Design a protein around this nucleic acid. Structure first.
Length: 43
DNA sequence: ATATCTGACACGTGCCTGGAGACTAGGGAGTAATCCCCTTGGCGGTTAAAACGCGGGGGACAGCGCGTACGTGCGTTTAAGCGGTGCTAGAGCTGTCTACGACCAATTGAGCG
């Protein structure tokens, strides 16, 4: 891949997923993952 | 009775709208020089203005009759939902060419002879 690691936040990712899925990743890093505690969330 | 629901009620960040600050430099505001203008104002070939004598036809009937109105028949009109699924705008991105910038020639207006 031409550029390696991308830095993001949950408010962007829940809208931008359609763009991010245009590129594959080897590994996912998910920081303060308690942001995902609600399975009811759109996030 | 109980699981768990629908507010209460708030700060998360997104979006764009919307304001004010400090800069350049585009252009607006101040001015003469001077011209050339809107304007004032007498001139006589030409038509607004109104009678008299008069021509073209406006005016008020009688009633014939080629069309006009009602409003129900009856068979042809669009309604109407909701199946599939191609079109359609979003929208992400070029891949340039096309109209709009930067440097300087043919043709014009100004000067007066």
């Amino acid at each position: 891949a031409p550029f390696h690691v991308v830095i993001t936040s949950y408010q962007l990712v829940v809208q931008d997923v359609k763009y991010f899925q245009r590129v594959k990743w080897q590994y996912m890093v998910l920081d303060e993952a308690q942001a995902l505690k609600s399975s009811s969330s759109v996030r």
